[PDB]
Short mmCIF file of C-alpha atoms and ligand atoms in Angstrom, two decimals:
data_model
loop_
_atom_site.label_atom_id
_atom_site.label_comp_id
_atom_site.label_asym_id
_atom_site.label_seq_id
_atom_site.Cartn_x
_atom_site.Cartn_y
_atom_site.Cartn_z
CA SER A 1 -17.34 73.16 102.00
CA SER A 2 -15.01 76.02 102.87
CA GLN A 3 -13.70 77.63 99.74
CA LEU A 4 -10.20 76.37 98.76
CA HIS A 5 -7.34 78.65 98.01
CA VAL A 6 -4.75 76.96 95.07
CA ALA A 7 -1.84 78.70 94.59
CA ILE A 8 -0.56 77.72 90.60
CA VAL A 9 3.63 78.32 89.70
CA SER A 10 4.29 78.88 86.00
CA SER A 11 7.68 79.09 84.37
CA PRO A 12 8.95 81.61 82.31
CA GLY A 13 8.02 81.50 78.73
CA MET A 14 4.57 81.62 76.88
CA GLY A 15 4.01 77.62 76.32
CA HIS A 16 4.30 77.54 79.98
CA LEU A 17 2.54 80.84 81.27
CA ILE A 18 -0.67 80.38 79.17
CA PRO A 19 -1.99 76.70 80.02
CA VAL A 20 -1.83 77.78 84.06
CA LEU A 21 -3.55 81.22 83.42
CA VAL A 22 -5.94 78.89 81.56
CA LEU A 23 -5.96 76.28 84.25
CA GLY A 24 -6.56 78.99 87.10
CA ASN A 25 -9.44 80.29 85.02
CA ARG A 26 -10.69 76.95 84.50
CA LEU A 27 -10.85 75.94 88.49
CA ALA A 28 -11.94 79.86 89.43
CA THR A 29 -14.71 80.00 86.91
CA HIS A 30 -16.26 76.35 87.05
CA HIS A 31 -15.12 74.76 90.60
CA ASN A 32 -15.64 78.13 92.90
CA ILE A 33 -11.89 77.73 93.93
CA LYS A 34 -9.59 80.80 94.61
CA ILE A 35 -6.91 80.87 92.17
CA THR A 36 -3.85 83.03 92.77
CA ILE A 37 -0.78 82.51 90.05
CA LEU A 38 2.54 82.53 91.04
CA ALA A 39 4.00 83.45 87.26
CA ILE A 40 7.97 83.29 86.91
CA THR A 41 9.15 85.93 84.62
CA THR A 42 12.37 86.89 82.86
CA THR A 43 10.87 90.68 82.31
CA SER A 44 12.76 90.07 78.81
CA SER A 45 9.45 88.93 77.08
CA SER A 46 7.27 92.12 76.01
CA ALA A 47 4.72 89.52 75.08
CA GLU A 48 4.32 87.92 78.36
CA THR A 49 3.28 91.35 79.70
CA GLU A 50 0.70 92.64 77.52
CA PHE A 51 -0.74 89.09 77.96
CA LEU A 52 -0.80 89.12 81.69
CA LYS A 53 -2.64 92.68 81.26
CA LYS A 54 -5.64 91.73 78.74
CA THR A 55 -6.27 88.83 81.81
CA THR A 56 -5.64 90.40 85.35
CA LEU A 57 -8.43 93.13 84.36
CA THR A 58 -10.80 90.17 82.91
CA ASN A 59 -10.27 88.27 85.82
CA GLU A 60 -11.08 90.94 88.49
CA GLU A 61 -14.44 89.49 89.86
CA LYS A 62 -13.24 86.24 89.10
CA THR A 63 -11.37 85.58 92.17
CA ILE A 64 -8.17 85.21 90.25
CA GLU A 65 -5.02 87.34 91.19
CA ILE A 66 -1.75 86.95 89.68
CA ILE A 67 1.19 87.96 91.20
CA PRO A 68 4.22 88.13 88.78
CA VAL A 69 7.83 87.26 90.30
CA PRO A 70 10.78 88.60 88.66
CA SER A 71 13.84 85.56 88.19
CA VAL A 72 16.98 86.48 89.53
CA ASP A 73 20.46 86.99 87.01
CA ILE A 74 21.48 83.45 86.50
CA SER A 75 24.26 84.47 83.63
CA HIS A 76 26.64 83.23 85.95
CA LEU A 77 25.50 79.64 85.22
CA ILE A 78 25.33 79.85 81.94
CA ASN A 79 27.09 80.82 78.73
CA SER A 80 26.00 81.11 74.73
CA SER A 81 26.10 76.83 74.91
CA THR A 82 23.61 76.22 77.66
CA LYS A 83 20.31 75.18 76.50
CA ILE A 84 16.79 76.57 77.00
CA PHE A 85 15.80 73.27 79.08
CA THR A 86 18.96 74.12 81.49
CA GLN A 87 18.15 77.73 81.67
CA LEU A 88 14.84 77.26 82.55
CA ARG A 89 15.61 74.78 85.38
CA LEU A 90 18.28 77.61 86.74
CA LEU A 91 15.61 80.50 86.51
CA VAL A 92 13.24 78.65 88.91
CA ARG A 93 15.78 77.13 91.10
CA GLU A 94 17.29 80.61 91.83
CA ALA A 95 13.68 81.78 91.79
CA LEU A 96 12.42 79.58 95.11
CA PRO A 97 13.92 81.77 97.79
CA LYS A 98 11.24 84.26 96.27
CA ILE A 99 8.17 81.98 95.84
CA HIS A 100 8.93 80.97 99.43
CA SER A 101 8.46 84.49 101.01
CA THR A 102 5.75 85.06 98.79
CA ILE A 103 3.57 82.03 100.10
CA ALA A 104 4.68 83.27 103.69
CA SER A 105 2.86 86.53 103.37
CA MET A 106 -0.19 85.47 101.76
CA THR A 107 -2.94 85.64 104.62
CA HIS A 108 -4.94 82.73 103.21
CA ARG A 109 -2.42 80.00 103.51
CA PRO A 110 -3.10 77.64 99.92
CA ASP A 111 -4.55 74.01 100.63
CA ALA A 112 -2.82 73.08 97.54
CA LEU A 113 0.20 74.16 95.03
CA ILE A 114 0.01 73.09 91.42
CA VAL A 115 3.43 73.86 89.92
CA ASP A 116 4.47 73.81 86.30
CA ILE A 117 6.92 71.03 84.55
CA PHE A 118 9.76 73.27 85.41
CA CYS A 119 8.54 74.23 89.04
CA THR A 120 8.82 70.52 90.09
CA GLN A 121 12.29 71.97 92.25
CA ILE A 122 9.43 74.11 94.72
CA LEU A 123 8.56 70.75 96.21
CA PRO A 124 10.28 71.88 99.45
CA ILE A 125 7.96 74.95 99.59
CA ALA A 126 4.95 72.72 99.83
CA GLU A 127 6.71 70.18 102.03
CA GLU A 128 7.53 72.78 104.40
CA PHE A 129 4.35 74.60 104.77
CA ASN A 130 2.32 70.81 104.49
CA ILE A 131 0.36 71.52 102.04
CA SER A 132 -0.93 69.30 99.04
CA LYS A 133 1.50 69.50 95.56
CA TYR A 134 0.63 68.24 92.31
CA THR A 135 2.48 68.84 89.08
CA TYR A 136 0.89 70.07 85.85
CA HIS A 137 2.66 68.42 82.86
CA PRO A 138 1.25 70.95 80.22
CA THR A 139 1.69 68.19 77.20
CA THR A 140 1.13 64.56 76.28
CA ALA A 141 0.79 61.62 78.47
CA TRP A 142 3.42 59.77 76.06
CA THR A 143 5.86 62.21 77.19
CA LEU A 144 5.10 61.80 80.63
CA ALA A 145 5.39 58.36 80.37
CA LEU A 146 9.09 59.01 78.85
CA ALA A 147 10.19 61.26 81.61
CA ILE A 148 9.33 59.13 84.21
CA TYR A 149 10.26 55.74 82.60
CA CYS A 150 13.73 57.39 81.49
CA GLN A 151 15.40 56.79 84.35
CA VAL A 152 15.15 53.03 83.66
CA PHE A 153 16.53 53.84 80.18
CA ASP A 154 19.41 55.33 82.06
CA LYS A 155 20.70 52.44 83.42
CA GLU A 156 20.18 49.86 80.62
CA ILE A 157 21.00 51.37 77.23
CA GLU A 158 24.74 52.95 77.70
CA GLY A 159 24.82 54.38 74.09
CA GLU A 160 23.51 57.48 72.91
CA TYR A 161 19.61 57.39 72.45
CA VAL A 162 19.94 58.76 68.68
CA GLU A 163 22.32 55.77 67.97
CA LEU A 164 19.82 53.36 68.39
CA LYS A 165 18.63 50.96 65.77
CA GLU A 166 15.61 49.62 67.52
CA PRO A 167 13.17 51.83 68.89
CA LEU A 168 12.91 52.59 72.98
CA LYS A 169 9.71 50.91 74.37
CA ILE A 170 8.62 52.84 77.13
CA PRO A 171 6.26 49.70 79.00
CA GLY A 172 2.32 49.82 77.75
CA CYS A 173 3.01 52.73 75.30
CA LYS A 174 4.04 53.34 71.29
CA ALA A 175 7.40 52.35 70.84
CA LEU A 176 9.44 55.80 70.24
CA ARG A 177 11.92 56.14 67.37
CA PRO A 178 15.17 57.28 68.26
CA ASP A 179 14.73 60.02 65.76
CA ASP A 180 11.49 61.32 67.65
CA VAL A 181 13.66 61.37 71.27
CA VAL A 182 12.98 64.79 73.09
CA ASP A 183 15.65 67.68 72.59
CA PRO A 184 17.51 66.36 76.20
CA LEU A 185 17.73 63.11 75.48
CA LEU A 186 19.64 64.04 72.13
CA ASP A 187 22.96 63.87 73.84
CA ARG A 188 23.88 62.30 77.33
CA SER A 189 27.27 64.23 78.01
CA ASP A 190 24.74 67.49 78.46
CA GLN A 191 23.51 69.14 81.31
CA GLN A 192 19.97 68.82 80.42
CA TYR A 193 20.07 65.32 80.12
CA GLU A 194 20.58 65.05 83.93
CA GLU A 195 18.40 67.77 84.38
CA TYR A 196 15.87 65.92 82.46
CA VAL A 197 16.36 62.43 84.41
CA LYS A 198 16.13 64.53 87.64
CA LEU A 199 12.48 65.63 86.66
CA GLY A 200 11.58 62.53 85.65
CA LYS A 201 12.43 61.34 89.56
CA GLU A 202 10.62 64.48 90.96
CA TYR A 203 7.29 63.81 89.20
CA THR A 204 6.70 60.49 91.59
CA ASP A 205 7.26 63.33 94.84
CA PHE A 206 4.12 64.78 93.99
CA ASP A 207 0.82 64.09 95.53
CA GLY A 208 -0.29 63.77 91.62
CA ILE A 209 0.04 65.02 88.27
CA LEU A 210 -2.40 67.09 86.36
CA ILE A 211 -2.12 66.52 82.27
CA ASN A 212 -3.41 68.71 79.32
CA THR A 213 -4.90 66.16 77.50
CA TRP A 214 -7.61 63.70 77.32
CA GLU A 215 -9.00 60.00 77.83
CA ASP A 216 -10.31 59.79 74.35
CA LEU A 217 -7.07 61.30 72.71
CA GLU A 218 -4.28 58.60 73.94
CA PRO A 219 -6.13 56.09 76.16
CA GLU A 220 -3.49 53.26 76.28
CA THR A 221 -0.59 55.76 77.60
CA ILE A 222 -2.75 57.08 80.49
CA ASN A 223 -3.80 53.37 81.04
CA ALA A 224 0.00 52.32 81.21
CA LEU A 225 0.81 55.57 83.64
CA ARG A 226 -2.38 53.99 85.78
CA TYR A 227 -1.91 50.53 85.81
CA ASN A 228 0.74 49.03 83.94
CA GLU A 229 3.12 46.81 86.40
CA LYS A 230 6.64 48.07 85.44
CA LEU A 231 5.55 51.79 85.35
CA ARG A 232 3.68 51.94 88.56
CA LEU A 233 6.76 50.65 90.28
CA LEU A 234 7.86 54.14 89.44
CA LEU A 235 5.08 56.36 89.25
CA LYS A 236 2.53 55.80 92.26
CA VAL A 237 0.46 58.76 92.42
CA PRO A 238 -2.79 59.84 90.34
CA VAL A 239 -2.98 61.17 86.96
CA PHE A 240 -5.67 63.40 86.00
CA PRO A 241 -6.22 64.14 82.36
CA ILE A 242 -8.30 67.77 82.57
CA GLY A 243 -7.81 68.85 79.00
CA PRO A 244 -7.94 70.27 76.18
CA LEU A 245 -7.16 73.43 78.00
CA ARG A 246 -6.80 76.36 75.90
CA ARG A 247 -7.66 80.32 76.19
CA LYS A 248 -10.47 81.82 74.78
CA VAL A 249 -11.04 83.78 71.88
CA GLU A 250 -11.42 87.56 72.86
CA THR A 251 -13.41 89.82 70.33
CA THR A 252 -10.92 91.67 69.50
CA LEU A 253 -12.29 93.92 66.22
CA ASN A 254 -9.46 96.15 65.56
CA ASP A 255 -6.53 93.43 64.43
CA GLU A 256 -5.94 93.83 60.96
CA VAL A 257 -5.34 90.16 60.12
CA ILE A 258 -8.40 89.31 61.06
CA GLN A 259 -10.09 92.34 58.74
CA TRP A 260 -7.74 90.29 56.25
CA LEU A 261 -9.38 87.22 56.99
CA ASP A 262 -13.04 88.46 56.53
CA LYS A 263 -11.97 89.30 53.02
CA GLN A 264 -11.35 85.72 52.30
CA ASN A 265 -13.08 82.61 51.50
CA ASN A 266 -14.03 79.78 53.89
CA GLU A 267 -11.13 77.10 54.74
CA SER A 268 -9.32 78.94 52.34
CA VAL A 269 -5.92 79.88 54.12
CA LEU A 270 -3.26 78.38 55.29
CA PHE A 271 -2.09 79.60 58.71
CA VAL A 272 1.60 79.56 59.80
CA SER A 273 3.49 80.02 63.01
CA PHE A 274 6.38 78.38 64.56
CA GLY A 275 4.96 79.03 68.13
CA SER A 276 6.24 81.99 70.39
CA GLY A 277 9.98 80.08 70.47
CA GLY A 278 10.49 78.93 67.22
CA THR A 279 12.76 80.43 64.47
CA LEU A 280 13.72 79.08 61.04
CA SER A 281 17.66 78.88 59.36
CA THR A 282 17.40 81.40 57.02
CA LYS A 283 18.07 78.48 53.99
CA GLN A 284 14.63 76.81 55.43
CA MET A 285 13.01 80.22 55.73
CA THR A 286 13.94 80.99 51.85
CA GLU A 287 12.45 77.53 50.66
CA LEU A 288 9.28 77.79 52.98
CA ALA A 289 8.93 81.44 51.38
CA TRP A 290 9.09 79.29 47.84
CA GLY A 291 6.87 77.25 49.33
CA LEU A 292 4.01 79.85 49.86
CA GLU A 293 4.01 81.19 46.46
CA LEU A 294 4.60 77.92 44.19
CA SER A 295 1.28 76.62 46.47
CA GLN A 296 -1.16 79.17 44.87
CA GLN A 297 -2.63 79.26 48.30
CA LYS A 298 -3.57 81.95 50.56
CA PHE A 299 -1.63 82.60 53.90
CA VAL A 300 -0.85 84.01 57.03
CA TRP A 301 2.96 83.90 58.24
CA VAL A 302 4.33 84.86 61.53
CA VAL A 303 7.52 85.47 60.50
CA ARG A 304 10.80 86.00 63.11
CA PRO A 305 14.53 86.85 62.21
CA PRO A 306 16.00 83.60 61.21
CA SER A 307 18.98 82.01 62.92
CA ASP A 308 21.06 79.07 61.64
CA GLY A 309 21.88 78.03 65.71
CA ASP A 310 19.01 76.77 67.77
CA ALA A 311 15.42 77.32 66.34
CA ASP A 312 14.60 77.64 70.24
CA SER A 313 17.46 79.74 71.29
CA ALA A 314 15.16 83.26 71.13
CA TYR A 315 12.44 81.16 73.53
CA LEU A 316 13.35 83.19 76.55
CA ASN A 317 13.19 86.62 75.24
CA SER A 318 10.32 87.72 72.68
CA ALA A 319 10.92 91.33 73.51
CA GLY A 320 13.37 92.67 71.05
CA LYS A 321 12.54 95.00 67.99
CA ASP A 322 15.67 95.10 66.48
CA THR A 323 16.49 96.68 63.05
CA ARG A 324 15.85 93.93 60.29
CA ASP A 325 12.97 94.62 58.37
CA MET A 326 10.85 91.57 57.07
CA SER A 327 11.72 92.09 54.02
CA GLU A 328 15.48 91.27 54.56
CA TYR A 329 15.30 87.31 55.40
CA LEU A 330 12.66 87.06 53.14
CA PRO A 331 13.25 86.79 49.28
CA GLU A 332 13.61 89.56 46.65
CA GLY A 333 10.13 91.41 46.41
CA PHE A 334 8.17 88.80 48.15
CA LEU A 335 5.53 91.06 49.98
CA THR A 336 5.13 92.78 46.75
CA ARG A 337 4.75 89.00 44.49
CA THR A 338 2.50 87.80 47.68
CA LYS A 339 0.17 91.28 48.32
CA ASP A 340 -3.55 90.04 48.24
CA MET A 341 -2.57 86.36 48.07
CA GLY A 342 -1.01 85.96 51.58
CA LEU A 343 -0.03 87.90 54.70
CA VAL A 344 3.34 88.17 56.25
CA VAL A 345 2.91 89.02 60.07
CA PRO A 346 6.10 90.02 62.02
CA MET A 347 6.74 88.58 65.41
CA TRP A 348 3.36 87.77 67.08
CA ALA A 349 -0.17 87.10 66.10
CA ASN A 350 -3.57 86.50 67.48
CA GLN A 351 -3.58 83.04 67.00
CA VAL A 352 -6.64 81.83 68.45
CA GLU A 353 -8.79 84.37 66.72
CA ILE A 354 -7.07 83.28 63.76
CA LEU A 355 -7.68 79.40 64.19
CA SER A 356 -10.82 80.13 65.28
CA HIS A 357 -11.74 82.34 61.88
CA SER A 358 -13.54 80.88 59.07
CA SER A 359 -11.23 81.48 56.62
CA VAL A 360 -8.52 79.43 58.41
CA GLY A 361 -8.76 75.71 56.28
CA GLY A 362 -4.77 74.91 57.73
CA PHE A 363 -2.09 75.11 60.08
CA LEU A 364 1.42 74.83 59.31
CA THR A 365 2.83 74.18 63.12
CA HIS A 366 5.78 73.31 64.76
CA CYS A 367 3.51 71.07 66.96
CA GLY A 368 3.94 73.07 70.35
CA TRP A 369 0.92 71.30 72.39
CA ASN A 370 -0.98 74.43 72.98
CA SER A 371 -0.63 75.22 69.80
CA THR A 372 -1.75 71.84 68.64
CA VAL A 373 -4.94 71.84 71.08
CA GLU A 374 -5.90 75.29 69.54
CA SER A 375 -5.86 73.70 66.31
CA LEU A 376 -7.75 70.19 67.27
CA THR A 377 -10.37 72.16 69.33
CA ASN A 378 -11.28 74.55 66.13
CA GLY A 379 -11.59 71.27 63.79
CA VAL A 380 -8.30 72.59 61.72
CA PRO A 381 -5.68 69.86 60.11
CA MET A 382 -1.94 70.92 60.30
CA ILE A 383 1.35 70.26 58.67
CA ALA A 384 3.70 68.91 61.37
CA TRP A 385 7.06 70.99 61.97
CA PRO A 386 8.44 70.32 64.81
CA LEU A 387 11.71 72.32 65.69
CA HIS A 388 12.55 71.54 69.62
CA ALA A 389 11.43 70.30 72.94
CA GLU A 390 8.64 67.34 72.73
CA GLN A 391 7.22 68.15 69.29
CA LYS A 392 8.75 65.59 67.71
CA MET A 393 6.79 63.08 69.89
CA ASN A 394 3.87 65.23 69.21
CA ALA A 395 4.27 65.58 65.54
CA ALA A 396 4.78 61.51 65.73
CA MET A 397 1.52 61.45 67.33
CA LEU A 398 -0.62 63.49 65.29
CA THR A 399 0.56 61.91 62.08
CA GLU A 400 0.92 58.62 63.04
CA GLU A 401 -1.43 57.45 65.42
CA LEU A 402 -4.24 60.30 65.52
CA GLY A 403 -4.16 61.08 61.48
CA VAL A 404 -4.73 64.50 61.73
CA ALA A 405 -1.81 66.07 60.19
CA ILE A 406 0.71 65.80 57.35
CA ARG A 407 4.24 65.86 57.53
CA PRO A 408 7.79 65.89 55.27
CA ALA A 409 9.51 63.08 54.47
CA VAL A 410 12.01 64.10 56.60
CA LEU A 411 12.17 66.00 59.99
CA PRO A 412 12.77 69.55 59.09
CA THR A 413 15.47 69.16 61.53
CA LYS A 414 17.31 66.58 59.91
CA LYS A 415 17.37 67.61 56.54
CA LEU A 416 16.01 70.94 54.67
CA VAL A 417 12.73 71.06 53.25
CA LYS A 418 12.82 71.90 49.76
CA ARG A 419 10.01 74.58 48.15
CA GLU A 420 8.49 71.93 46.16
CA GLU A 421 8.00 69.52 49.03
CA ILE A 422 6.18 72.69 50.94
CA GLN A 423 4.05 73.76 47.93
CA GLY A 424 3.06 69.84 47.68
CA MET A 425 2.16 69.27 50.99
CA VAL A 426 -0.05 73.10 51.28
CA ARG A 427 -1.70 71.96 48.29
CA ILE A 428 -2.51 68.10 49.62
CA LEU A 429 -3.89 70.01 53.01
CA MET A 430 -5.91 72.76 51.63
CA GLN A 431 -7.12 71.45 48.21
CA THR A 432 -7.08 67.73 48.17
CA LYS A 433 -9.62 64.93 49.03
CA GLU A 434 -6.95 63.06 51.47
CA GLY A 435 -6.74 67.28 52.88
CA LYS A 436 -10.62 66.74 53.35
CA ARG A 437 -10.11 63.50 55.04
CA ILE A 438 -7.55 64.80 57.41
CA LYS A 439 -10.03 67.86 58.29
CA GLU A 440 -12.65 65.71 59.33
CA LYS A 441 -10.73 63.37 61.59
CA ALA A 442 -9.97 66.79 63.10
CA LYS A 443 -13.39 67.72 63.81
CA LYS A 444 -13.89 64.29 65.33
CA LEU A 445 -11.30 65.23 67.90
CA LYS A 446 -12.98 68.64 68.13
CA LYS A 447 -16.20 67.13 68.90
CA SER A 448 -14.03 64.54 71.51
CA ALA A 449 -12.47 67.29 73.33
CA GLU A 450 -15.60 69.39 73.57
CA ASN A 451 -17.52 66.07 75.14
CA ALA A 452 -14.07 65.64 77.64
CA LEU A 453 -15.04 69.21 79.24
CA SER A 454 -18.84 69.01 79.01
CA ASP A 455 -20.43 68.06 82.15
CA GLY A 456 -19.87 64.35 83.13
CA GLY A 457 -16.81 63.01 80.69
CA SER A 458 -13.54 62.12 81.47
CA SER A 459 -11.79 65.68 82.00
CA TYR A 460 -14.15 67.63 84.10
CA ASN A 461 -14.72 64.40 86.25
CA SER A 462 -10.48 64.75 86.58
CA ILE A 463 -11.25 67.94 88.03
CA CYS A 464 -13.45 67.06 90.61
CA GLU A 465 -11.66 63.95 91.16
CA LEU A 466 -8.22 66.60 91.97
CA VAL A 467 -10.19 68.69 94.27
CA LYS A 468 -11.66 66.14 96.05
CA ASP A 469 -8.24 64.75 96.93
CA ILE A 470 -7.38 68.27 97.69
CA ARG A 471 -10.27 67.85 100.35
CA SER A 472 -9.49 64.92 101.72
CA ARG A 473 -5.82 65.95 102.39
CA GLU A 474 -6.67 69.07 104.03
CA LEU A 475 -6.86 66.34 107.00
O1 U2F B 1 2.07 83.88 67.54
C1 U2F B 1 2.15 83.63 68.64
C2 U2F B 1 2.65 82.32 68.63
C3 U2F B 1 1.82 81.55 69.89
N1 U2F B 1 0.89 81.96 70.52
C4 U2F B 1 0.47 81.39 72.13
O2 U2F B 1 1.43 81.24 72.55
C5 U2F B 1 1.48 79.24 73.13
C6 U2F B 1 2.44 78.58 72.16
O3 U2F B 1 2.28 77.58 71.49
P1 U2F B 1 3.03 76.51 72.31
O4 U2F B 1 2.24 75.64 73.42
O5 U2F B 1 3.30 75.34 70.93
O6 U2F B 1 4.68 76.86 72.64
P2 U2F B 1 5.93 77.19 72.76
O7 U2F B 1 6.34 77.88 73.59
O8 U2F B 1 6.38 77.51 71.36
O9 U2F B 1 6.27 75.48 73.16
C7 U2F B 1 6.73 75.41 74.07
O10 U2F B 1 5.97 75.07 75.48
C8 U2F B 1 4.78 74.05 75.32
C9 U2F B 1 4.40 73.97 76.51
O11 U2F B 1 2.80 74.19 76.21
C10 U2F B 1 5.25 72.62 75.04
O12 U2F B 1 4.25 71.77 74.63
C11 U2F B 1 6.04 72.84 73.45
O13 U2F B 1 6.79 71.50 73.03
C12 U2F B 1 7.31 73.71 73.68
F1 U2F B 1 8.19 73.92 72.64
C13 U2F B 1 0.21 78.99 72.51
O14 U2F B 1 -0.65 79.21 73.50
C14 U2F B 1 -0.25 79.96 71.44
O15 U2F B 1 -1.64 80.08 71.24
C15 U2F B 1 0.05 82.89 70.40
O16 U2F B 1 -0.59 83.62 70.73
N2 U2F B 1 0.98 83.55 69.01
C1 T83 B 2 13.56 71.38 75.65
O1 T83 B 2 12.60 72.01 76.12
C2 T83 B 2 11.45 71.24 77.08
C3 T83 B 2 12.03 69.42 76.58
C4 T83 B 2 10.64 68.48 76.97
C5 T83 B 2 10.76 67.43 77.18
C6 T83 B 2 10.04 66.35 77.24
C7 T83 B 2 8.87 67.02 77.91
O2 T83 B 2 7.82 65.92 78.46
O3 T83 B 2 8.68 68.12 77.91
C8 T83 B 2 9.46 69.21 77.66
C9 T83 B 2 9.41 70.67 77.46
C10 T83 B 2 10.37 71.44 77.01
O4 T83 B 2 10.15 72.81 77.30
#
C-alpha cells in the first residue's frame, strides 16, 4: 500500500480553483494520499492570491503542496468579443508546455493526474508519462450528460438550439428546454461552440470522471451515464460522484459582516451574491436595489460595478479596485435609507461563513454550483438568478426537480426583473409558509448530502473506488 501521489490541475477562476483545493484537501485528509496542485492563474485576480494564502499555511503538515502556474499572454488570440469559455481554453492550452516541465521536474512522479473541466487539454502530459488520467467536472451530472451527448446533437439539429420549439432530450435524462442551454450552445457560429463540442469528446479519453454531486441528488442522470445504451456508446468509462465537496468554514471573527449578522434575528437575512464572476446591468441593479427595500427584509448584498455587456466578462480578473464608489450605481441615498436594515459589501465576502450563520435565512444566488452546494449543505433556500455558464440548467434543477429554490417567471437574462417581482420573491422566501416548506426541502438535501460523505454512502465510497482504480492502473 505504498503511498499515492496525485497531481490536480486547476484552470483560472475561483469556481475552478476552489473545488480543486477542496478536492485535494478531501483526499489528503481522509484517504492518506500526497496531493500536489498545479493551479493555473492569470495573476490578475487578487482574490485567488489571498485565497491561496489562507490554505497553504493551513495545509503544511497536511501533505498538500500548491504550485501556482502563470498563464502565458493570449492577447494575440482574443479580442473584446472572445468569450470567457474560449479565453479559458486558450489560457490552459498555452500553459501546456509549462505543466509539462513542472511534472518532469517532480521527483515523486504522480501516479494519477486529475484535471479540471478546462484542463482536458493536458491529456497528452499524462499519456506521455503513462499516468492515470481523470477529469473533474465540478458541476451537475446533467451538464456532463449534455457535454458528452452534444456531439450527437451537433449532427442532427441543423439550426440553432435556441430556435428549437421542442426540448433537447439527452438520452435517459431530464429534457432540456431550448432556453436553459448553457452559454456555449447559445450561438453555433461562435468559437466556443466548437470548443464545447471538443470538450464533450475529450471527456471520453480519460480513465474516469469525478463529479461534484451525489447519487441521491440526481439519481437518473448518473444511472443514464452508467447504463444508458445510447450514452454508453459515447462515454465508456467510470463516473465518480464524490460530492458535495465544499470548503470548511474558517473561524474568522474580525469580520464586520459577521459582527453585523450577530446582531440579527435567526433566519432573518437574505444573502445576495452573483458569485465570483457575475455582474448585473445597471437597470437590473437598480430594480434589485428597490426590490431590497420594498421587501422590508434584512439583507447582505455583495455588489460589484454594473455592466451592460456580458455578466461574466469580469470573471477572469477580480483584482480591479477602480474609482467608482458603490454609492454611484446604487440609487440616490440607498445606504442612508437601508442602513440598519441591510449591508452593501463591495466586491467580495466570506460566503461560507455567512451561509453557515444563524441569521441567514435565504440566498439570492446566480446558481453557480459551488455557491449552490454551500447553500444546500447549510440548508439555506434560494432565489435562482442564473446569469452565465450552466447556471440556467442548475436553476432548472433546483426549482423544477429538487424544489429548493424559487425564481422569476422569466429568466433575468431574457427580460428585466422588476422591483415588485423581486420584493415579492424575497418576501415569499423569507416570510411565507411556502418559504418555510422550501427551507425544509433544503434541510433534507443537507442531511442527504451529510450521509453521502459520511463513511459508507455514495460519495465516500466513490473515492475509495477511484483510489482502487488508481492502484490497479499502477500496473
Ligand atoms: O463573494 C464571494 C463569491 C464567491 N465566493 C466563492 O467562490 C466560488 C464561486 O461560486 P460558484 O462556484 O458559483 O462560482 P463562479 O465561478 O461564479 O461560477 C462559475 O464556476 C462554477 C464552477 O464550480 C460553475 O459551476 C458556474 O456555473 C460558473 F459560472 C464559491 O466557492 C464561493 O463560495 C466567495 O467566497 N465569495
Ligand atoms: C461559459 O462558461 C462555462 C460553460 C459551461 C457549459 C457546460 C458545462 O458542463 O460547464 C461549463 C462551465 C463554464 O465555466
